[PDB]
Structure formats: structure tokens, C-alpha cells
């Protein structure tokens, strides 16, 4: 709700982001074709999602900064940094869809699967990352928190990249071993690959702009946010197989890609040796029938039910964490976030 | 020479770089497998080249900073930033070899062509980039030039990425048009894709550590260095076809990849309509015979001779630029660099 009534402003502000990332180089006509390609990459890859992560920076900003400091300029910096978080996401998805061999994202074909794009998408992803820091400099160069944001974004990228490394190492193609698909291993992957940049990063950016730079305050916010992030990726795993493609906007690949998903960890925990053997011989393979075999085993073990029960318990667990760790921050900062991802 | 007698120190110092990038995370055992993979990526991709770019930061540092300020610690920061430039390079080569469909680099098979690696190499490249900023923070957090280096490296990456975008747009696969292969277009590509990070970036980093942050001094250094860079990429184009693979350490792909190389621009400038038609129908294709046809046309037009003449004239041109633009900087800063790449 407090997002929805602030979304439209955010989405519209994108045109100025795309304008300013393009006119910055008007005094360099020779790179015109590159700047055009960057436009195309932005319009295709920073748009069509829910913008939750960017809206969070903005929403949290209004809650953290005293109203008599929210000038038209502080507001503009807030949603630029918001779009910066969306660019980080755009950067990671473009590359992730190549490495996961995905087909669609946000209701359209993956950038790299577009005729004419292919593996040039790799440089496209890097430009999106670069755009972040061009904007931080254009809008926040002179702010007291400038360097804090730079380091926040860089650190968040390294963490996400460590996460992706765990995510790929644990899912070797053509290499089944269900034995590495454990609960500890799972929690490590999603903490790094999702939770830092999706939940800590947006709120922390807002915090730093609000002048809240205390190590102890960030640690507290972090305790809540990384746990939210853990649930959010479990939800992403569940929806990869059981979600509605018209809603999720994309086709799941976790079983074919041999991924350490929450679903496969839960399945391993409940399976008889007969069932385990069936998973062993059908997982991590590209054949429709073998994937359907795994899905059927999940439903036989009533994992969709198990998931629905974990969403209730997780939600209670996160609310408690908010009771313990929210202050001095307004609990609504975390509640509007929790509200957005639960049910 | 002033490099060679400083090389061995630089190369040995790499172990501490790899150690410090690995122990930073000892208090995070869960990412052990990721940190191991990062080790493997570093050892395979930051090693086996000539280290010219990194040595330049170091060499230029000794020339720019007063000796009674070169403590054991300032020296250590100097060659860390030197290795940071080498990591940027490692980052760009890994990704470039995928997008150029290259086979070998520095005498070995390309990282991404290694069994088991494949397109996971994309995340590997991003980790190498991340490593830069981990090191800048570990060693230069408290220096006055800290933020200047961060911005220098980020800006250099965006410029190189603009360069790569021009490089790829101009070479559409399956799309011959020799008409876009012009001299202006060529100069634009190599300026951005090579000259900024290979020549401006190392010297500028040294400058900033030496406290030389003046806009006018950097512009002057830049005038010399980007022109050196233009020649260096022309040399890279020449060697891609006519260089010795035991020396260059890699197989050329410019004709197959349909690239706007200096060789193809020179050929277009000298060719009769008969010759032009032969280029038109043999360029940009993967067939050995068709590539041999192009190479033969280059030799018929005596391009190797033309190149040798451009190396002489370029060298004179760069020396003049050094006479005009070097001061107040020691001319040796630029002379040791020029000496390293000419003949
Ligand atoms: Zn994915
Ligand atoms: Zn993935
Ligand atoms: Zn997923
Ligand atoms: Zn290449
Ligand atoms: Zn290339
Ligand atoms: Zn080349």
C-alpha cells in the first residue's frame, strides 16, 4: 500500500534516469551508437518487474528522514538510489539468465535469447552495473554519505557474486550428487546470492542517506533483513516449480539446472530410499519427462503443503525479529517490507 | 629495463594479494568453496601475461613520489594498485574471450573453454572486478586519494565497456558491411576499448597517489597516453593476423569475428573493386580457406610493410607529444612506457 501509492512516481522517474544517462555523453558524439545500445539495454532490462527493491529505498527514506529535510532534491536523490538498486538487479538478472539457461523473464524472452544479442549480453550486463556509479556521482557526489553508498553497492555486488559462485559450484551440470544438497549449504547460498542485495542493501542505502551510519544499527537491521531474504528465496524456489508463469513472468529451470533448491532439500529430508533413487536418476536433466517425474515426487511428498506451513512460521519468526531488533528504527520500515512479500 | 628490474618484485607480491583476498573471509567458513574458486580464478587469469600495465603504476610511482615518502607501506600500496590494474585487465579478458569466441590466451586455453567452466566464467569475471575494490579498501581506505582511485577505476571500466559496445556493434556476426569499417569509427573504438584502461589508467593512478590531482595535468598526461593506446591497439590488430602465436600467446579471431581491425580499414583504403569484392565475400566467416583468402589479400596489398611504416611514424608522433605535454612530469614516465611498446 505505502509502496503502491508511491510506485507510479518511481516508474515515471525512470525517463529522467534514461535521459541523464544518455545526455551525459552528448559532448561525445562518437559513442552515439554505444549510448543508443545502452538505452535499449536499459529499457529492455530495467523495466517490467515489480520494482519492489527500488521502491523500498524510497519508502524507507520517507520513514527515516525528517520531513523538514525532504526537499525536492533529497527526494530526487532517494529515487535515483532506488533506481540504482534496480540497476544492480538488472545487472545480475541478465547474467543469471545466461548462466541458468533461462528462457523468459518479466513476461518476455530473455535479453540474451533475443536474435542479434546472444553473448554480447555479457557486456550489456556490465554497462548496467556501470550506470549505477555514474548516477551516484551525478546526484550524490557532494552528499556526506556518497562514499558510504559506493562501498555499500560494491560490497553488495561481491556478496551476491560469492552467492552465485556457491549457487553454481553446488549445481554442477551433468553432475548429480544429492549429497551436497543440504540445509546448511542451502542457507549459505541464499544468504549471499539474494538476501544481501535484495533486502539489506535497499534499507541500508536509505539508512545512510538518513544519516544512520552506526555499525550497531546496521547490524540490527541486517538481522531482520537477511532472514526476510532467506524466506524470499525459498519462495522463489517454490514458485520456480509451482508458481504461475503468467504471474511469475518466467519459466523455472531449477530441476534441469541441477539446483540446490529449497524443494530438493525438503524432498531429500523426507524421501524413502526408493524415492531418493527416483530423484537421483531424474534430477539435473533436460528431459521434460524426467522433470515431470521429480515434480510428481514433490507433490507425492506434499511439499506444497509443507511450503505453505513454512510461510506461516517464517512470517511469525520475522515478526518476532522485528519486535527484538527494529528500534530505534520505525517498525513500519520492516512491516511494509514484510507485508509485501508475505502472502 | 626500469620495468624488468622491478618485475620480479611485482610478480612475487602476487602471493600476498591472493592470500589477503582469501583470509579476509576466514571468519566466514561457509563461503569456503566460493573463496577457493576465486583463488583458482585468480591464479588462472591474473597470471601468465607481461604485467606491463601493473608495472607501470609501480614504475611511475617511484618516478612521481619523492624518495623520502616511499616507505615500505607506500610501496606496498603502489603495487597493490598495480595488481588492481591487472585485475581489471583479467576481468575484461575473461569476458572478451567469450564474446570473441577465442581459443587461447597467454599460452593456455581460455578460462571459459576449460571443461567444467563454460559460461560460469561470466560470474568469475565479475569476481575479479570485485577484487579490485576489496583491495583498494584494504590498503588505501585511509589515504587522501582513496576516493580518486575508486572513481578512476569505475570510470575506466565504463569507458572500456563503451569501447567493447562499439567493438561489437560494428562487428555484427553474419553481417558483412565493409562500409562501416572506417578510420573515424576505428579510432573511436580503440580509444575507449583499450587506450583509457591500458595507458591512461595506470599512469593516472600513480599520479593520484603522488598527489597530482590537477585536472590540467591529467588532461596533458591523457593527450600522450591515449595516442600511445591508439598505436598499441593497431599493433594488437596487426599481431592478431601476422604475429607469432608462440609470442602473442593466443590465436587471432578478427577476420572470423568480422572485426573493424586496423588491417581491414587499411585494406579497404587500398583495394580495387575486384579486391574489395574478394574481401566482401571472404570476411567475417569461420572457414579456414576464406580467412586465408583475406590474409593473402592483405599481403598482396603489402599491409605488413604499411604497418612497419606506421610504427615508425607513430613513434615519432608520440615522442613529439611527449616534448609538448610531459611537463611538469618527468619525461621518463612516458619514455619508459613508449620504450616498452615500440619495437
Ligand atoms: Zn536464475
Ligand atoms: Zn541463478
Ligand atoms: Zn529462481
Ligand atoms: Zn579479444
Ligand atoms: Zn574483443
Ligand atoms: Zn586483438
Give the SSE map.
Two copies of one chain form a homodimer.
Chain A: H1 4-12, H2 14-23, H3 32-45, H4 52-64, H5 72-99, E1 104-105, E2 108-109, H6 121-140, H7 146-170, H8 183-209, H9 215-242, H10 245-248, H11 262-270, H12 273-282, H13 288-300, H14 303-325, H15 331-341
Antiparallel strand pairs in A: 1-2
Subcellular location (chains A, B): Cytoplasm
GO cellular component, one term (chains A, B): cytosol
Protein name (chains A, B): Farnesyl pyrophosphate synthase
CATH homology group of chain A = Farnesyl Diphosphate Synthase
The distinct ligands, each listed once, are:
zinc ion
What's the domain count of chain A?
Answer: 1
Q: Determine the most extensive contact between two protein chains.
A: A-B, 44 and 44 residues
Q: Helical amount among residues of chain A, as a percent range? A: over 70%
Modified residues (N6-acetyllysine) (chains A, B): 50, 280
Site (Important for determining product chain length) (chains A, B): 91-92
Cofactor (chains A, B): Mg(2+)
Family (chains A, B): Belongs to the FPP/GGPP synthase family.
What does this structure look like?
2 copies of one chain form a homodimer. The first copy, chain A, is mainly α and 343 residues long. The first copy, chain A, has one domain: Farnesyl Diphosphate Synthase, CATH 1.10.600.10. Chain A is 71% helix and 1% strand. Chain A is built from 15 helices and 2 strands. Chain A has helices spanning 4-12, 14-23, 32-45, 52-64, 72-99, 121-140, 146-170, 183-209, 215-242, 245-248, 262-270, 273-282, 288-300, 303-325, 331-341; strands spanning 104-105, 108-109. The first copy, chain A, has a two-stranded antiparallel sheet. Chain A is globular. The A-B interface holds A 30-31, 33-35, 37-38, 95, 98-99, 116, 118-120, 122-127, 130, 133-134, 137, 147, 150-151, 154, 157-158, 161-166, 168-170, 172-173, 184, 188, 192 and B 30-31, 33-35, 37-38, 95, 98-99, 116, 118-120, 122-127, 130, 133-134, 137, 147, 150-151, 154, 157-158, 161-166, 168-170, 172-173, 184, 188, 192. The site of one zinc ion has 3 residues of chain A, from loops. It is classed as transferase. Keywords: cholesterol biosynthesis, transferase. It forms a dimeric assembly. The entry is titled "Crystal structure of human FPPS in complex with alendronate". Chains A, B: Farnesyl Diphosphate Synthase.
